Paper text:
Moreover, Acl4 is required for the soluble expression of newly synthesized RpL4 and for the protection of RpL4 from the Tom1-dependent cellular degradation machinery. Whereas, unprotected RpL4 is targeted by the E3-ubiquitin ligase Tom1 for proteasome-dependent degradation, interactions with Acl4 and Kap104 sequester Tom1 ubiquitination sites in the RpL4 loop and extension. Thus, ribosome assembly chaperones can serve dual functions by facilitating nuclear import while simultaneously protecting unassembled ribosomal proteins from the cellular degradation machinery.
Crystals of the Chaetomium thermophilum Acl4·RpL4 complex, which included the Acl4 TPR domain (residues 28 to 361) and the globular core of RpL4 (RpL4CORE) and the entire elongated loop (RpL4LOOP), diffracted to 2.4-Å resolution. Acl4 adopts an α-helical tetratricopeptide repeat (TPR) fold composed of seven TPRs (αA-αN) and a C-terminal flanking helix (αO) with an overall right-handed superhelical twist that accommodates the entire 70-residue RpL4LOOP with its concave surface. The structure reveals an extensive interaction encompassing 70 exposed residues of the internal RpL4 loop that are sequestered by the concave Acl4 surface on complex formation. The longer central Acl4 helices αF and αG form a hinge between the N-terminal (αA-αF) and C-terminal halves (αG-αO) of Acl4, which rotate as rigid bodies by ∼10° from an open to a closed conformation on binding RpL4. In contrast, binding to Acl4 results in a great compaction of RpL4LOOP by more than ∼15 Å, sequestering a maximum number of residues into the protective environment of the concave Acl4 surface. Acl4-binding induces the formation of an α-helix within RpL4LOOP (α3, residues 89 to 97), which is entirely devoid of secondary structure elements in the context of the intact ribosome. In contrast, we identified a single charge-swap Acl4 mutation, E266R that abolished the Acl4–RpL4LOOP interaction almost completely. Glu266 is located on the top surface of Acl4·RpL4 and forms hydrogen bonds with the mainchain amides of RpL4 residues Met100 and Phe101, thereby anchoring the C-terminal end of RpL4 helix α3 and compressing the RpL4LOOP to the Acl4 surface. The crystal structure of Acl4·RpL4 now shows that Lys56 is located in the highly conserved RpL4LOOP and is sequestered by the Acl4 surface, thus shielded from Tom1-mediated ubiquitination.
Author numbering:
A (entry chain B): 27 to 361
B (entry chain A): 4 to 78, 89 to 188, 203 to 272
């Protein structure tokens, strides 16, 4: 009959067209004609993993990604056959234990990536089909690796923050990450994250200003622009170290991309509330003594809109919902 | 062969006609743009972050919510700063590792948003007033903007009324950040840059060249259905430009 590899390509096209339901069907039939012993078992299970992630079925996604690992335990298979390091990284995030279990998965993923990077570099000095293609592939791989190290940093500042060598391990991760991808905003974002928790605020600002300078000037669809969730984390870092002005621009772009994002309406409202507090304290020394009122007016508009979308989406972050109310009530009292 | 009629400055069909580019045939998936920017699907607690696992320890205050928490005035301790030293605790970012899929989805989303722009019910749902527009897609003869035709602001504003964009421009006049109005899409190589100098004066209307089309203008807030005024020159290239990238 038909070749199952063609079915994998078809399901991938369907997934890339946002037709997730049909992709799952085609990917399922595909795998049935491949099986666990099949040549493309790893890639097939990986794909079924991606699909169920996009569907929000985390438990199905974990089982598929886990089965993919059992087929390619060391990740040595070509990405085309075995799926690649992606399955290790997803298992780390989907880990129900988190902590050491996530780091273990991430480390396995980093190991595969580092070997692939090293292989592409050997293929570079070997006469390549295109030097530009390899360097691009190397860049992509180094960025995924850098993001993996950053992912581990964040585990040590949450799940494993009680570890004595937590700060030491983070310091080693961000040194390697800045080495391999100094042009990637997330590396410097993560450097700032560490610095903040090290009570090094000025260096945190310095790092964040650097990460922004790598993408804020790009066109909105350019591959250099960090993903939405990564930019949410950025806003939290920006408000933390008193760069609300920058946070305002970032939150406005984000809302221009998804205005049903409860957490972004909140962050933008809060960033504007904080900014209003500052301008208000400096009001006596300021030229426009009333500027802060307009800043708090927009803060109120963002927060009102946050609660509005909160209701419509039936959001479940109760503490964020109650705080938005407190902030509005507060702005009202001060006129 | 489906074709779209081109209108002159007067507001009537010039008799000429253009081939409907194939991209308008793309399937419309309303929440494709929201999907591109989503964290974890159908997560209502913290969609942009992997939840913190405290283990046998006690969870920090800032964990499990997006709200800021109170913070002590700033100038081992590292772990304590992380949990209770910050307004916003550090979070495990939800990272979508299958990058190429996400990139492909952005590419399709652009096609899907283009298609949505030529569906009147979707445009009205986004709050555009298009009952007076004679046809979608709305194509104006490039001769009406060849050079210094609509360099003047009086000439550009007059063009929008005759073409039926009037009610949507005036809508904005009630009560930068103007994704609410019509988007004028023009071909730089033929239409020039003069027309932009005339339209920039008008409030509500937005300017953009065919090659520089993005989802921010085609799908504001992640909602498909932008009111677009095409120049004849832009429509022809439109099919080639999207295939170029």
């Amino acid at each position: 009959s038909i070749n199952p590899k063609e079915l994998l390509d078809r399901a991938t096209t369907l997934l890339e067209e946002g037709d997730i339901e049909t992709a799952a069907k085609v990917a399922r039939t595909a795998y049935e004609h491949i099986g666990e012993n099949g040549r493309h078992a790893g890639a097939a299970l990986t794909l079924l993993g991606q699909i169920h992630v996009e569907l929000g079925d985390i438990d199905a996604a974990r089982n598929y990604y886990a089965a993919a690992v059992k087929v390619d335990e060391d990740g040595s298979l070509p990405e085309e056959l075995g799926g690649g390091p992606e399955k290790f990284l997803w298992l780390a995030q989907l880990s129900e234990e988190g902590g050491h279990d996530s780091v273990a998965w991430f480390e396995r993923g980093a190991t595969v990536l580092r070997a692939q990077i090293q292989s592409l570099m050997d293929s570079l000095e070997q006469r390549p089909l295109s030097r530009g293609q390899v360097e691009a592939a190397i860049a992509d791989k180094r960025r995924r690796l850098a993001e993996t190290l950053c992912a581990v940093v964040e585990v040590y500042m949450t799940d494993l923050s009680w570890e004595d060598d937590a700060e030491q391990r983070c310091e080693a991760l961000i040194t390697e990450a800045t080495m391999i991808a100094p042009e990637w905003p997330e590396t410097w974002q993560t450097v700032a994250n560490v610095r903040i928790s090290q009570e090094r605020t000025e260096e945190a600002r310095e790092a964040l200003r650097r990460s922004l300078g790598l993408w804020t000037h790009l066109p909105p669809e350019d591959p250099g622009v960090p993903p939405f969730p990564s930019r949410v984390s950025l806003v939290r870092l920006l408000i933390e170290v008193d760069m609300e002005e920058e946070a305002l621009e970032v939150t406005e772009r984000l809302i221009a991309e998804d205005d049903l994002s409860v957490e972004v309406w909140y962050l933008g409202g809060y960033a504007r509330y904080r900014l209003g507090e500052k301008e208000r304290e400096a009001s006596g020394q300021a030229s426009e003594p009333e500027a802060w009122k307009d800043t708090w007016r927009s803060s109120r508009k963002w927060l009102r809109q946050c609660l509005k979308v909160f209701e419509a989406e039936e959001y479940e972050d109760e503490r964020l919902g109650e705080h938005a109310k407190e902030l509005i009530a507060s702005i009202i009292g001060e006129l | 062969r489906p074709t779209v009629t081109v209108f002159g400055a007067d507001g009537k069909p010039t008799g000429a006609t253009e081939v409907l580019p194939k991209v308008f045939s793309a399937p419309i998936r309303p929440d494709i743009v929201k999907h591109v920017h989503t964290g974890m699907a159908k997560n209502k607690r913290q969609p942009y972050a992997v939840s913190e696992k405290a283990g046998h320890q006690t969870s920090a205050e800032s964990w499990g919510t997006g709200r800021a928490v109170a913070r002590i005035p700033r100038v081992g301790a590292f772990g304590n700063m992380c949990r209770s030293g910050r307004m916003f605790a550090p979070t495990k970012i939800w990272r979508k590792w299958h990058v190429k899929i996400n990139q492909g989805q952005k590419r399709f989303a652009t096609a899907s948003a283009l298609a949505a722009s030529a569906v009147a019910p979707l445009l009205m749902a986004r709050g555009h007033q298009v009952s007076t527009v004679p046809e979608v897609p709305l194509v104006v003869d490039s001769a009406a903007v060849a050079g210094d035709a609509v360099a003047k602001t009086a000439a550009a504003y007059k063009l929008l009324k005759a073409i039926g964009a009037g009610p949507d421009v005036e809508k904005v006049k009630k009560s930068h950040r103007q994704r609410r109005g019509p988007l004028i899409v023009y071909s730089p190589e033929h239409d020039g840059k003069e027309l932009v100098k005339g339209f920039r004066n008008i409030p509500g209307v937005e300017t953009c060249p065919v090659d520089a089309l993005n989802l921010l203008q085609l799908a504001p807030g992640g909602h498909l259905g932008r009111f677009i005024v095409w120049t004849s020159a832009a429509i022809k290239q439109l099919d080639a430009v999207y295939e170029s990238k």
